[PDB]
């Protein structure tokens, strides 16, 4: 599967069976920078929590940077 | 004054006395794409409204893309 | 003189060169931080409004900030 993998913005090749994901979360710099937005691939989907917004999908290049698709 | 001017991400030269600005607003595609985020320079600052978030500043390159600097 | 040269981040440059650190904002400055360029040149490079350059003359004097 092809997935986006930060810090780069180009598509990368991941092993068959992985999922592409985005993960928006607070790292050590949240009070200064706001939430980090990571794009990656993994064998399992990361976990949805009160402070973590997550997308997971199983088709090529399905994890570009998230956007709010509405006003 | 130097300001960022979309669609490019590099600093541009604007006449002395202009302000750099950011403007986040709903254009024709808001229901599909979300709010547009423009960076520009103008002689006066654009207007703050219920649907328009605006930054204005008067130093070089002071209008990069906005971020939420907190969780 | 030994300088860092991005994106390698250490190279041997001819004696008389200086190392440098260029930093500046592009439109991603709040998203990724400032742009950073490390290199070496026979003389301290000239840049423009908004760009900070620090030139130094000792080995490894331009590490990643």
């Amino acid at each position: 599967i092809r997935c986006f993998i930060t810090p780069d913005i180009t598509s990368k090749d991941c092993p068959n069976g992985h999922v592409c994901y985005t993960k928006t979360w607070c790292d050590a710099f949240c009070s200064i920078r706001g939430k980090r937005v990571d794009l990656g691939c993994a064998a399992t989907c990361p976990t949805v929590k009160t402070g973590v917004d997550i997308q997971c999908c199983s088709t090529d290049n399905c994890n570009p940077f998230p956007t709010r698709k509405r006003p | 004054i130097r300001c960022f001017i979309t669609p490019d991400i590099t600093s541009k030269d604007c006449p002395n006395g202009h302000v750099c600005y950011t403007k986040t607003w709903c254009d024709a595609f808001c229901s599909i794409r979300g709010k547009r985020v423009d960076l520009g320079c103008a002689a006066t600052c654009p207007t703050v409204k219920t649907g328009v978030d605006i930054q204005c500043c008067s130093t070089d390159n002071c209008n990069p893309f906005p971020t939420r600097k907190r969780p | 003189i030994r300088c860092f040269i991005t994106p390698d981040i250490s190279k041997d440059c001819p004696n008389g060169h200086v190392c440098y650190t260029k930093t500046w904002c592009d439109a991603f400055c709040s998203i990724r931080g400032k742009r950073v360029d490390l290199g070496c040149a026979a003389t301290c490079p000239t840049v423009k409004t908004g760009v900070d350059i620090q030139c130094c003359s000792t080995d490894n004097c331009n590490p990643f900030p």
């Binding site: 930060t6 810090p7 928006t24 790292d27 710099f29 920078r33 706001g34 939430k35 980090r36 937005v37 990571d38 940077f65 | 971020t67 939420r68 | 930093t23 991603f28 709040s30 998203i31 990724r32 931080g33 400032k34 742009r35 950073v36 900030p65």
Partner: peptide, 8 residues
């Protein structure tokens, strides 16, 4: 870039 990640 200074940071090793993308921040919103």
């Amino acid at each position: 870039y200074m940071w090793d990640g993308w921040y919103m």
